[PDB]
């Protein structure tokens, strides 16, 4: 039975590869997920299949994540990458090294940077081994982007656009540009006095000048005064009630018997 | 109380200033007077 079901899963994967190696992949991956349920989604120890499960686990889940990124669906990317991460970092002794892994791993790092999840980003970097941070290109590039973004060299962050180890690193560069614009905003409204229209266009790398109105049509920092890009800077009474509360608290803890 | 075994293990109250300067205040002042 086990051999037959493994053969069926292998045949479905071979059909998948023959397909592409979009929607056809959709239903094929659905059925493959069902068959994986049939078999072993996450050995979870104890069973110790030692079937080199990593083989089919990677097959299905990397192909699923790749189809996801071609589809531009972040929830599916999250699902597939979570599973893939489990398979990567967990069954280390049994699993054979997968050279086709760092791509998705660094792409995940790029996704975290894209959705401004710096905490999780650094947690996963820590999870990664030390050498890979400085040796591999697939991981170095997202590391480089995050380092630049934290330093503040947004110009270098932008110039890195052309530098991409593999075209798979796509749509997260775009979400990253959007998030970078949001962070630039954050800076502008937290600490400036007023930025005129020309200087706003120069600083915030907006879309074409006609849409330059963007992010003011969207965030709208009370713009309008004098020149429409006056930035409307977004920059003394005794708290008697609160002080009374605190002093009464002193009295309470001083007079209560204990 | 308990030595945390799980963790492997001048007389001048210096406070920085151990920088690298063109002497402390001799060549600096010489050049200062020279350019003034």
């Amino acid at each position: 039975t086990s051999g037959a079901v493994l053969q069926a899963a292998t045949g479905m994967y071979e059909q998948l590869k023959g397909e592409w190696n979009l929607s056809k992949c959709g239903e094929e991956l659905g059925r493959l997920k069902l068959v994986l349920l049939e078999l072993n989604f996450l050995p979870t120890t104890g069973t110790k299949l030692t079937k080199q499960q990593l083989i089919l686990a990677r097959d299905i889940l990397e192909i699923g994540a790749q189809w996801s990124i071609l589809r531009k669906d972040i929830p599916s990317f999250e699902r597939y990458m979570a599973q893939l991460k489990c398979y990567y970092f967990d069954y280390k002794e049994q699993l054979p090294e997968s050279a086709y892994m760092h791509q998705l791993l660094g792409l995940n790092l790029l996704f975290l940077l894209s959705q401004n999840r710096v905490a999780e980003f650094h947690t996963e970097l820590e999870r990664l081994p030390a050498k890979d941070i400085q040796t591999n290109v697939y991981i170095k590039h997202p590391v480089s982007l995050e380092q630049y973004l934290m330093e503040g060299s947004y110009n270098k962050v932008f110039l890195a656009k052309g530098n991409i180890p593999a075209e798979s690193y796509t749509f997260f560069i775009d979400i990253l540009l959007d998030t970078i614009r949001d962070e630039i905003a954050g800076c502008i409204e937290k600490a400036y006095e007023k930025i005129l229209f020309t200087e706003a266009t120069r600083i915030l790398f907006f879309n074409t000048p006609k849409k330059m109105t963007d992010y003011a049509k969207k965030r709208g920092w009370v713009l309008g005064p004098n020149n429409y890009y006056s930035f409307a800077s977004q920059q003394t009474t005794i708290p008697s009630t609160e002080l009374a509360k605190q002093v009464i608290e002193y009295a309470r803890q001083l007079e209560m018997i204990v | 109380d308990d030595e945390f075994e799980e963790f492997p293990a001048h007389v001048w109250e210096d406070n920085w200033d151990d920088d690298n300067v063109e002497d402390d205040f001799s060549n600096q002042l010489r050049a200062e007077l020279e350019k003034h």
């Binding site: 710096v118 905490a119 999780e120 650094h122 947690t123 970097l125 820590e126 999870r127 030390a130 941070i133 380092q147 934290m150 330093e151 503040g152 060299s153 947004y154 110009n155 954050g186 800076c187 502008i188 937290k190 600490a191 400036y192 006095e193 007023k194 930025i195 005129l196 200087e199 600083i203 920059q235 708290p239 002080l243 605190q246 608290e249 002193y250 803890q253 001083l254 204990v258 | 109380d1 308990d2 030595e3 945390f4 075994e5 799980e6 963790f7 492997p8 293990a9 109250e13 210096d14 406070n15 920085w16 151990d18 920088d19």
Partner: protein, 421 residues
């Protein structure tokens, strides 16, 4: 017969040590036979030095002259060696023996048996002995480099220790579990556990110290640097004085890195103190490099002591360093200046152009480490005119925290004035 005479004196000392063990036992019965709480700490505090003085032949005689009720389980100790709480104490002593003897198979088995025993007995004065047993079992598995099965074991045991409204066992299990997560570099599960567990407000000093170290490390990796620095500093202030050289070294190392990240420069009395100089010297060089802003010397220090960084565990914080190195420059500039012009920050911060100055200083303000405004109509970065903070509620608030604290110590001190009868 010099060897014989030395053995004779050592065995007289051993009789003294056996008397000390008997006194510890007697204190344990004062607690449990007396049934009063605590006093297990009284009988236990001498565990470290007693472990130091442990001796093989002494224990050989102990495992034949002790255990008044000879339940025959003494033969799980006798071959390797060649009450409801005293038995746990003796078993912990024996696992200590194998520990220092480097015998980590019967050590693990005997620790497992001790754990089965303590788990079976649902005592309330045995929780402290259970805590010490947990710690040494973890250390056995650590010298054996599993650190994995212990995760589930300790984690279930923590569940039990928190169902039973215990404090010492709860804290120690939480601490060892966090150590396991950190040893496997799981700084997401570690964070979730710390977020959804509450540390006993009334916990041992030595356990507060370790918990604070691990929590500070978690936050430091997680990029919450201000609370990370507060936690590590409080951990250091909590740490023992005349001991725990290694623990102090590690807390100090992480504190140096975390401060450098916040943008500050540490205190040099650290690198002064003799117990640490050799340990922290790489961080001495690193702090020099960061303070100077000399990226060349920084790269030299990384290439020259990188192995120690990957050993202690700092190697990502020391690149986040690079970032906060440029940040440290801008913080010094904005600490001594009030209206520096951008073209003048470009230079004095080692930048390229006033545009890069705009971006970097704006991000510094966003991170809230320089606390200034900015103006690009003419191009200057005017700071905040300091307001006299005594016609303000800041003194109110500071003294409020300190008065609350003093009142709390008076409360806790008038409490705990137990009278015996």
């Amino acid at each position: 017969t010099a060897a014989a005479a030395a053995e004779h004196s050592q065995r007289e000392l051993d009789t003294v040590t056996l008397e000390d063990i008997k006194e510890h036992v007697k204190q344990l019965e004062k607690a449990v036979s007396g049934k009063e709480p605590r006093f297990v700490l009284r009988a236990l505090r001498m565990l470290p030095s007693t472990s130091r003085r442990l001796n093989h032949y002494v224990l050989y005689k102990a495992v034949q002259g002790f255990f008044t009720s000879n339940n025959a389980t003494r033969d799980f100790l006798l071959p390797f060696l060649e009450l409801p709480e005293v038995e746990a104490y003796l078993q912990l002593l024996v696992v200590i023996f194998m520990m220092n003897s480097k015998r980590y198979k019967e050590a693990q088995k005997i620790s497992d048996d001790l754990m089965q025993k303590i788990s079976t007995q649902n005592r309330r004065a045995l929780d402290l002995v259970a805590a010490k047993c947990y710690y040494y079992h973890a250390r056995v598995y650590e010298f054996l480099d599993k650190l994995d099965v212990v995760r589930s074991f300790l984690h279930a045991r923590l569940r039990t220790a928190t169902l039973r409204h215990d404090a010492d066992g709860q804290a120690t299990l939480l601490n060892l579990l966090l150590r396991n997560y950190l040893h496997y570099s799981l700084y997401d599960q570690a964070e979730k556990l710390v977020s959804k567990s509450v540390f006993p407000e009334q916990a041992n000093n030595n356990e507060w110290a370790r918990y604070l170290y691990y929590t500070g490390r978690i936050k430091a990796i997680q990029l919450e640097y201000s609370e990370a620095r507060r936690t590590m500093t409080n951990a250091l202030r909590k740490a023992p004085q005349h001991t725990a050289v290694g623990f102090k070294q590690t807390v100090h190392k992480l504190l140096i890195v975390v401060e450098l990240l916040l943008g500050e420069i540490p205190d040099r009395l650290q690198f002064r103190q003799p117990s640490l100089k050799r340990s922290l010297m790489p961080y001495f060089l690193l702090t020099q490099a960061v303070r100077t802003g000399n990226l060349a010397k920084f790269n030299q220090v990384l290439d020259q002591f990188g192995e120690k960084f990957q050993a202690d565990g700092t190697y990502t914080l020391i690149i986040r360093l690079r970032h906060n190195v440029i940040k440290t420059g801008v913080r010094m500039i904005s600490l001594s200046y009030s209206r520096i012009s951008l073209a003048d920050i470009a230079q004095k911060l080692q930048l390229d152009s006033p545009e890069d100055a705009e971006f970097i200083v704006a991000k510094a303000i966003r991170d809230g480490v320089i606390e200034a405004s900015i103006n690009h109509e003419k191009g200057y970065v005017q700071s905040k005119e300091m307001i006299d903070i005594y016609s303000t509620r800041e003194p109110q608030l500071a003294f409020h925290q300190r008065i609350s604290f003093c009142l709390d110590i008076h409360n806790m001190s008038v409490k705990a004035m137990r009278f015996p009868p």
